[PDB]
Design a protein around this ligand. Sequence first.
Ligand SMILES: [Mg+2]
Ligand SMILES: [Mg+2]
Ligand SMILES: [Mg+2]
Ligand SMILES: [Mg+2]
Ligand SMILES: [Mg+2]
Ligand SMILES: [Mg+2]
Ligand SMILES: [Mg+2]
Ligand SMILES: [Mg+2]
Ligand SMILES: [Mg+2]
Ligand SMILES: [Mg+2]
Ligand SMILES: [Mg+2]
Ligand SMILES: [Mg+2]
Ligand SMILES: [Mg+2]
Ligand SMILES: [Mg+2]
Ligand SMILES: [Mg+2]
Ligand SMILES: [Mg+2]
Ligand SMILES: [Mg+2]
Ligand SMILES: [Mg+2]
Ligand SMILES: [Mg+2]
Ligand SMILES: [Mg+2]
Ligand SMILES: [Mg+2]
Ligand SMILES: [Mg+2]
Ligand SMILES: [Mg+2]
Ligand SMILES: [Mg+2]
Ligand SMILES: [Mg+2]
Ligand SMILES: [Mg+2]
Ligand SMILES: [Mg+2]
Ligand SMILES: [Mg+2]
Ligand SMILES: [Mg+2]
Ligand SMILES: [Mg+2]
Ligand SMILES: [Mg+2]
Ligand SMILES: [Mg+2]
Ligand SMILES: [Mg+2]
Ligand SMILES: [Mg+2]
Ligand SMILES: [Mg+2]
Ligand SMILES: [Mg+2]
Ligand SMILES: [Mg+2]
Ligand SMILES: [Mg+2]
Ligand SMILES: [Mg+2]
Ligand SMILES: [Mg+2]
Ligand SMILES: [Mg+2]
Ligand SMILES: [Mg+2]
Ligand SMILES: [Mg+2]
Ligand SMILES: [Mg+2]
Ligand SMILES: [Mg+2]
Ligand SMILES: [Mg+2]
Ligand SMILES: [Mg+2]
Ligand SMILES: [Mg+2]
Ligand SMILES: [Mg+2]
Ligand SMILES: [Mg+2]
Ligand SMILES: [Mg+2]
Ligand SMILES: [Mg+2]
Ligand SMILES: [Mg+2]
Ligand SMILES: [Mg+2]
Lengths: 79, 185
Amino acid sequence: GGSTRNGRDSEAKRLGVKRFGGESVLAGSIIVRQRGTKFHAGANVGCGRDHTLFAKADGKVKFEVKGPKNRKFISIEAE
Amino acid sequence: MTLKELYAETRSHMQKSLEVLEHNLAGLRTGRANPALLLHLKVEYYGAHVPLNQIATVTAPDPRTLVVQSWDQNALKAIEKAIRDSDLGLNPSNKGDALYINIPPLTEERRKDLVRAVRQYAEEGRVAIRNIRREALDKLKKLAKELHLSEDETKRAEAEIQKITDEFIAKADQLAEKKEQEILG
RNA sequence: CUUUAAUGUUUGAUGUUCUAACGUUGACCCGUAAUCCGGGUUGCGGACAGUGUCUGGUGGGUAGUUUGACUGGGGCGGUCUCCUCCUAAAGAGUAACGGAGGAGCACGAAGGUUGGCUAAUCCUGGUCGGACAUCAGGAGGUUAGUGCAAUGGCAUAAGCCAGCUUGACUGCGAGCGUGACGGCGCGAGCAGGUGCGAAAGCAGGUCAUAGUGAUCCGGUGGUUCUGAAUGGAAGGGCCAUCGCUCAACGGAUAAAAGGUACUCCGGGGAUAACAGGCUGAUACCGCCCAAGAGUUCAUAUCGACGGCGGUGUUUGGCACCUCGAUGUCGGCUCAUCACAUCCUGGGGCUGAAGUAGGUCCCAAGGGUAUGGCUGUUCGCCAUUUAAAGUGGUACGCGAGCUGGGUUUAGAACGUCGUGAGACAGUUCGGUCCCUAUCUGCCGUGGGCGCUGGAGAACUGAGGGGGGCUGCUCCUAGUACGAGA
RNA sequence: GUUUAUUAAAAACACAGCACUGUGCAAACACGAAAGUGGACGUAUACGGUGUGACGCCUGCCCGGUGCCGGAAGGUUAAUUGAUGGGGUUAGCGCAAGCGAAGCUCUUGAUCGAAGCCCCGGUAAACGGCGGCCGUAACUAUAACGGUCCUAAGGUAGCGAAAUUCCUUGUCGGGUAAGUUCCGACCUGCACGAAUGGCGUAAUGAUGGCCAGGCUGUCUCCACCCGAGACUCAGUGAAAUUGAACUCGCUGUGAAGAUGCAGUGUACCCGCGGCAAGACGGAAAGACCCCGUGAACCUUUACUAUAGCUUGACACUGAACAU
RNA sequence: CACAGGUGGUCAGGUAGAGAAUACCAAGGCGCUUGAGAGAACUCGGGUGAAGGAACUAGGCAAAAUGGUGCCGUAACUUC
RNA sequence: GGGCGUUAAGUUGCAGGGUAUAGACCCGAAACCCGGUGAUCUAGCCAUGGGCAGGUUGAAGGUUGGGUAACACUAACUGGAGGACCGAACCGACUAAUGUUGAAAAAUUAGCGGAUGACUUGUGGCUGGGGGUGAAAGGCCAAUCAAACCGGGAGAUAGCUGGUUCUCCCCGAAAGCUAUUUAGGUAGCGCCUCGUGAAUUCAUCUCCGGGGGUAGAGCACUGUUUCGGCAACAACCCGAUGCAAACUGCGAAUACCGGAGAAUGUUAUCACGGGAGACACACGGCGGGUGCUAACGUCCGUCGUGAAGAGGGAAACAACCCAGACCGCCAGCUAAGGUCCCAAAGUCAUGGUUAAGUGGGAAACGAUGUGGGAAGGCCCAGACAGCCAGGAUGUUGGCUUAGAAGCAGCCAUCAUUUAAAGAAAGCGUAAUAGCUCACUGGUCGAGUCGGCCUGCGCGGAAGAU
RNA sequence: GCCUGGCGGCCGUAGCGCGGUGGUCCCACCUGACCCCAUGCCGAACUCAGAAGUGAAACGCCGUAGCGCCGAUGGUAGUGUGGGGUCUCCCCAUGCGAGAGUAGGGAACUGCCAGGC
Ligand SMILES: [Mg+2]
Ligand SMILES: [Mg+2]
Ligand SMILES: [Mg+2]
Ligand SMILES: [Mg+2]
Ligand SMILES: [Mg+2]
Ligand SMILES: [Mg+2]
Ligand SMILES: [Mg+2]
Ligand SMILES: [Mg+2]
Ligand SMILES: [Mg+2]
Ligand SMILES: [Mg+2]
Ligand SMILES: [Mg+2]
Ligand SMILES: [Mg+2]
Ligand SMILES: [Mg+2]
Ligand SMILES: [Mg+2]
Ligand SMILES: [Mg+2]
Ligand SMILES: [Mg+2]
Ligand SMILES: [Mg+2]
Ligand SMILES: [Mg+2]
Ligand SMILES: [Mg+2]
Ligand SMILES: [Mg+2]
Ligand SMILES: [Mg+2]
Ligand SMILES: [Mg+2]
Ligand SMILES: [Mg+2]
Ligand SMILES: [Mg+2]
Ligand SMILES: [Mg+2]
Ligand SMILES: [Mg+2]
Ligand SMILES: [Mg+2]
Ligand SMILES: [Mg+2]
Ligand SMILES: [Mg+2]
Ligand SMILES: [Mg+2]
Ligand SMILES: [Mg+2]
Ligand SMILES: [Mg+2]
Ligand SMILES: [Mg+2]
Ligand SMILES: [Mg+2]
Ligand SMILES: [Mg+2]
Ligand SMILES: [Mg+2]
Ligand SMILES: [Mg+2]
Ligand SMILES: [Mg+2]
Ligand SMILES: [Mg+2]
Ligand SMILES: [Mg+2]
Ligand SMILES: [Mg+2]
Ligand SMILES: [Mg+2]
Ligand SMILES: [Mg+2]
Ligand SMILES: [Mg+2]
Ligand SMILES: [Mg+2]
Ligand SMILES: [Mg+2]
Ligand SMILES: [Mg+2]
Ligand SMILES: [Mg+2]
Ligand SMILES: [Mg+2]
Ligand SMILES: [Mg+2]
Ligand SMILES: [Mg+2]
Ligand SMILES: [Mg+2]
Ligand SMILES: [Mg+2]
Ligand SMILES: [Mg+2]
C-alpha cells in the first residue's frame, strides 16, 4: 500500500552532557544535521562533516549560549 | 475506475433502464383512475404544444373523473380538443376553469392485451438489467487485475454488484406489480 | 620467386566400378536318418551396412530433486535491502499487514581555495512588455535558494558569481560514537609531497543523513616475499583493482515449476472449519427532541434531521476451550423454557355509530394447519383455522431414527490449465457402529426406621394431572344506524 | 457384453463401423546388456499406433503458435586436423642492459566439419482457436441485427435456460386445487457446436427425471394375532472400558459448557425391568486446516542428468578411375 | 471354531408338472450338543385389518399387486 | 606513532563439568536402496477335459404352385439361424431389511441380471515388482498395492510428540535484541549459576552542573477554522474565536547523564573464565498505535503480580488488595477486610440522610419524591388559587382562494374605546357561527412563584432448567 | 566629565517608527581620477590623489510608547510518589507548577585604547 519503511537507529544526540571527563576528543554531541543546534566553540571545535561537535583538549564541558540570536554553542574549558 | 465508480455505473444504467420501463408502463391506458396517464398531455398554446407543465392545469377529482383546470380563460378549450390526438381522444364537457373527464373500467379484450403487455414490459426490463449486471461484473474483473485487488476484495466487490442488481430487479417487479394490480383489478 | 596452366606425384572432396574384408533370416553339401551351430560350395549385397571409442541433436521414456518466508488460520493481494518524518511518554533505543514520502544515483565540477555577491514577493513608474521577461526606485526581510525525499541546518552563509587549481592526495592516527558479530561512522594531530591565499589559514570530495553485496572462485598490474633436488618457471602470498537487482538485498546450489479428492507420516486446538466463550460495530426490540401528514390538528395512526439505550438475536471481530476425533444442514420422534403474545381473557386512547378494526397496557392457563414445488430451513402457491406467534435450549434432539443437501475414492458437462489436475459450478452413483457401569428419567420390588407386636381405616404437609375453543339459537332484528 | 474382489454397474471401459498414421518384411513395433523371440510360419484386402464409437443427415472457417511431413540454397554449429602468434627454459651473445637460435615444452586457435536450429513450403478425423469497442433505430429507448479496430481466422449446419445458464424458481404455454421438478416453446448461449464429433435415431437398459391406472398399513392412526429373542429357573460363561470414588438439581465461578469449586435446594439404605438427555460417553496419537527447509506417486516448454532414437570423425576398412 | 460361507465329477424312483421348477413322498439320511417356564415394553420374521388410498417420502423405499394354457385382439413409431 | 608481544609455570596422570567423532539419553515414522520368496487368491493368456432342465421365435437356403421372354417377384410347405426370447442348474450382483463385540474380516433372507456365449468350469502351465496383467477402476498380483512379501544396509533420518527412576542444602532465570529458506529450531548479546580478580566500584537521598521540546499551552510559522472589516464571487491583509501525530515566536513534572557529600546495604558493581536454561508469556496500572478510547482483541513503552509464591481478603476467581511460607507451639499485636445469625469481633457512641429492599446492575430524557443552602420577582394600593362578570370598533385587515371573516397559507400586526379588549392561543364551520384563552374589574383574606448551588432517592429497566 | 572613532561584553525592557538635533575635530558624504586597483555596464562599489562645500543622506545622540520586547502576585493547566471515584474521564494528600492573559516594566547598560573640548 506504500505506507511503511523507516530509517534505522541513527542515534545523534548529547553523549557528553555538561562538564564531563572530556578525553582527547569524546563527542559531547553527535546531533548531526545541525550547526545551530550545537555550535563549535571554545577549546572544542572540529564539527566534522556530519556536523559532529568535535571536542579537543581534555577538560570539562560548558554548554553555553552566546552571540547575536540565541545560538547554543558548546566548548570545553580546563578542569 | 474504482470498485465504487463501478457500483455507481451499475446503479445509474440500471436506473435508466428502470425509467425506460417506468414511463414505458405509463404509456398504457390503465384504469386511467390516476393522472399518471394525462401527466404528459401537451397543451398546444402560443404556437407551441407546450405541455401542461407551464401552460394549463388538470387533476382527477375522484377515481372516475378528472378536471382540466385551465389557467388561461381560453386554454380551457385547448386541452378540450387536445383530449384527442392521443389514446384519449375523448370529448369532455366545458364547465369553469376545470374540465371534466370521467374514469371508468375497460373491456376484457383489452384486459387480455393489457395483461400480457404489463408482464411483458416487466420481463423486458429484467433482461436489460441482467445484461447490465453482467457488464458490471466484467468491468469488475478488469479492476481486479488492475487495482491489484485480492481474492477477498474482488469477491466482496462481486457480492456488492449482485446487491445493486437485485435491488433494481425488485424495483421493476414492484412497479409492474402496481400498474398491474390496478390494470388487472 | 612471383598469377595460369600441361604431364608427373601426393593428398583431401564428391561420385562411379571392382572383390577381397564384412553381411546374408537365398540355394546346396558334410558333421547328421537336427528347425540350432560350425565348416565347405554358390548366388546376392559389399567396403556399404553394422559395431567399438569420441561427438552435435533429440530425449518426462526413466531417475534424483527444487519449487522461500512474513501473514490477525492458509491462500489471494502485498511485502522482503537503504534513507526521512510521526508513532516514541522533552537522553539512546522500541512494535503493528500503523500514518506519509523517497534511494539502487548525479557531478573533473555540482570538488578545493581565494576574492566578491545576496534573496521571494508586492507597489509605483518605464519602447515594443502583456498575469508573468529586462529597467528604476520603494516596501519586504532567511516567506528565496539547496542536483534529487523528508528532517535538521545554512548570512561567517552550505545559497550565488568569478580567478586559479586537483586535498575526490599517500602513509598513520590521540580519542570517541555505534553495532551480538561481520562491520559502519566522527576524528584533532604526525610524516611525505599538493593547491589556493599577502597572510592568518583552509582543503584527506560534495550541507549532512539514501545511492548498496560479505565469502569463495578467478582476471589484470606491481613485487626479486615464497617456489617440493638446484637455477629458473608454473603456482602461491602481499599490495592495488575488476566480475553477483546473490533485490527472498547476513548472500543454503554454478544449476529448480507444479498436482494429489489415490494419497501417507510426525506434530498443533501454538492454527482455520462446527458448536461454546469474550465483544455487540452490525442486527433486532425499545425510548428522547418534534419539522412535517394527518382537510383543520406534532404525538388516533405515522414521523424528517439528529440523540440514548436494551437483548444476545443476525452479519461480523477475536482465536480462550476441544485437532491421542465435541459427527454438518433439513426431516422424523420427543420435547422444555422465555415473553418482545398469533388466538382466547382484562383494560386505556381512537380519525372508537354499530359490526369490524388501529395502537398501547396487562396477561405465558391452554391452544397455535393439511397439502403442491424444492434437500431445504425459508419462501411462493392451493385450501383451511379462533389462531396458524417470535425466540433460547451444542442454530434442543444420530451411544434415538433418516442420509435428501453437504468434503473421499467412479464418471460426464460448462469453464481454467500445455498438463497432472482444478471449481463456495453442475450432473448420475456412493457401507451411518456401540449388549448402558455412573448421573438422570419411567416403572417396580427388597431392607431397615418410625421405640411392645399386629390387622385395618384415615388425616393431608406437600407433589403431579387438567386448564383450548368454533358455530347455531334466545336475548334481539332490539341498542346503535340514513340505511346497509 | 466389461468394471472399482470388500460403500460407485453408470451417462464409464469394450464393441462392430469410421478416419488418420506408421510399416516392402531380417517390416513397423515390442520383450531382451546380447543370443534370441513375439509381430507371423502372416506380407499392404497384412500388421501396429492413435482418436471417434451402430445406423441416418452430416462433419464449416483458421497452418499464426506446437507437433509432424517435404525442401535444405544460404546463416550458425560437435568431435576431428591444427595454421598462426605468444610464453617458460638455454647454447651462444655480451663487463653489464638485455637479446636470444635449435630442441623440449605451455598456450593460441586459421582451417576441415554432419544432423540439428534459423529459413522456405505443406499439414487440423494433428495439439489446438473461432472476435472486441461497441456501429447506425416509435418518448428515452435499446443496441440481438451488425459498422469500425485488430485477428491465424473470427463459430456454418444443427442445437440451445441443455448431464452445459451464473442472475435462476428467466418468460410463456401444458399438466395440478396448488408444480424451485417435468414436458413444449422463446434465445438474453455468464461459458453448445460439428470424429477430446453436431443433430437425430427404431430396438435395447437391475441407467437419470416426470406422470398415470392398478395396488396396497407408505401414510391418516394404529389394532389384534402366530412365531424367534427380551423376562424367570437350572448348567456353561464373554466384551470394550477402567487414575481413585463416600458417582444429586439448580444458579453462579472457573482453561471461558461442573457429580467434585461458592451459595443454595433437595435426598432413609440396596436391587430388578425399561429409556437414552449428560458423564464433552466407548472406539481410531483428526482423515478437514496449518506446520515440518517430512514422504510418496503423478505432470510439465521447472533443473540436472540418462536408456532409446539420430549426426559426423577415427577404427574393423581394401583396389582403380573421372572430375 | 464340531463356523448359516466355498468346493470339481457321477447317479436320477412315484403323484402332479413343460421340467434337473415346485409341492407331497420312496430308497436312504436327519430333528441342526444348552434345556424348562412365562405369554411384559421393545427388536426380528410373519398373518389379518374398518373408511380413505401415496395424503407417506428426498423418492411409492418397503409392501401390496401381476402371474398359467388356448383363443379373441392389440397404438405411435420402425432399421420392416 | 599504532597493532601484537615482552620478569603469566609448565607438564603428566587420577576424578568430575563441557565439546568433537561415533546410534551418543530411550522408544517411534511415512519412506529410500540391495538380494531373494511368491500367479495354491486374483488379472491376462496357453494346453487338455467337463457343463448349459424345460418352454418360444422362427433368418438363409430348398421343393411345389403362381408369375416372367428370362430374371425380379409371390405364396404355401420344408428348413433350421441368432453375442435371439421366457426360465432351473451354472455364472453374476441392481434393491431392501437383518446382521455390525456377525452364523460370516462382505454373509443371510426376499426380490434381481445373464443363461449356445466376448458363456461357464476342472487339471497343469506362462508372465515377478518400477515389473507383471488390466473390455481401464490404479483395478488385480495369497484378507497386503499411487509400487507385494521376506531378509539385509539398519540403531535410515525424526529442528516433532511422549518418557527420564534415591535424599537433603544454597542461588536462581527467560518468555527479549539482533541474524537466520528463520518464525514451535538455532547462534552472539541480555537475564541465571559457579570460580577468580579488582575499586568507596554500585544503589537510595541531598545538593551542584547539564541538554530536552513530551504534558500543557499558544496560533508568529506550516495547514486547518469561523465572525466581522477596505474586493463589477471571493484570496491577501486587519481585529475578534477555535483545531494539530507528521504546527511551535513558549514550556513543566520528570527521566536521563556527569560532579560532591552522609548514612545504609553480608559487594549489591565491573572484568575474565566452567555450566546453563531461555528467545510461545499472561493479567492489572499508567502513556499510546490499531480496533468501535469493542473484545479474557492486537502491537509497543514502563511498573507490579502470576509464570517460578503458599498464607489472609474479593462468596467461589493464576494475574486484583494485604502480605513473601527454615521447623515446632492449645501464646500474644496487627495488614487488607470485617464486628446481627450461618461465621472470629460493636445489634458500639454522636449527629444527619433514605423509606426505594435504593442499598444489592444499566443511558438520553422525564417528574409538586425529599434534606440543606444563597437569592430574586408579586404581594392588605389586597399577590396567589378559586368564584362573578366583562373581552368592543375600523375590520370579514391586505393578498390569496370556490371560500380564508382572530384561528390553510403569505405580509402586516397599527389605530380607536377603555377597568380591560392580541388584526388573536386552541377547538370548531364549507366559509360564518359558536366555545374556551391572554387580559381587566369585583369578590377572597396571607402568603405566593419559579430559577440557582448541593445531598439522597423515583421512572426509563423485556429472556429463556 | 562632554563629544567622537576603533575593538569587545551582553544580545529586543539593547529593536522599529516618529519628532528634534551634531560638524572643515572624528565620521559622513564630497572633489578629482592618467594612474594602483576596480565595473560580466557604470570611480555605484571597491581603489588611489585630495580641495571646495554640507550635515542633506547615512551615522551618533536626545525626546516620544504608537508597534515590538521583558514581565509578576494571584488563580488556572499539567505532573512525580501515595490513596480514591470512574463508560474512555476525574477527585483527594503532598511535592514540582506552566502557557496565555492582567499589574507593571521599558526609548539598554558596560569595559579597553585613541582623538578633540
Ligand atoms: Mg519425474
Ligand atoms: Mg535423497
Ligand atoms: Mg509461511
Ligand atoms: Mg527520543
Ligand atoms: Mg511594471
Ligand atoms: Mg546532499
Ligand atoms: Mg535477510
Ligand atoms: Mg481416479
Ligand atoms: Mg496425521
Ligand atoms: Mg485456542
Ligand atoms: Mg467459532
Ligand atoms: Mg468447548
Ligand atoms: Mg408484555
Ligand atoms: Mg409447508
Ligand atoms: Mg443442533
Ligand atoms: Mg446409530
Ligand atoms: Mg447424500
Ligand atoms: Mg473423480
Ligand atoms: Mg447389459
Ligand atoms: Mg465395489
Ligand atoms: Mg454395487
Ligand atoms: Mg467416446
Ligand atoms: Mg472439424
Ligand atoms: Mg402427484
Ligand atoms: Mg426444455
Ligand atoms: Mg462439448
Ligand atoms: Mg459421443
Ligand atoms: Mg436370556
Ligand atoms: Mg442363568
Ligand atoms: Mg454452569
Ligand atoms: Mg438400547
Ligand atoms: Mg467420544
Ligand atoms: Mg494428531
Ligand atoms: Mg453343531
Ligand atoms: Mg384397510
Ligand atoms: Mg406427496
Ligand atoms: Mg409431507
Ligand atoms: Mg420395491
Ligand atoms: Mg410381495
Ligand atoms: Mg440370449
Ligand atoms: Mg434368461
Ligand atoms: Mg488352475
Ligand atoms: Mg488382495
Ligand atoms: Mg547405514
Ligand atoms: Mg529408528
Ligand atoms: Mg538465507
Ligand atoms: Mg497537546
Ligand atoms: Mg523519554
Ligand atoms: Mg524464536
Ligand atoms: Mg516471541
Ligand atoms: Mg509483550
Ligand atoms: Mg491479551
Ligand atoms: Mg513454563
Ligand atoms: Mg436492586
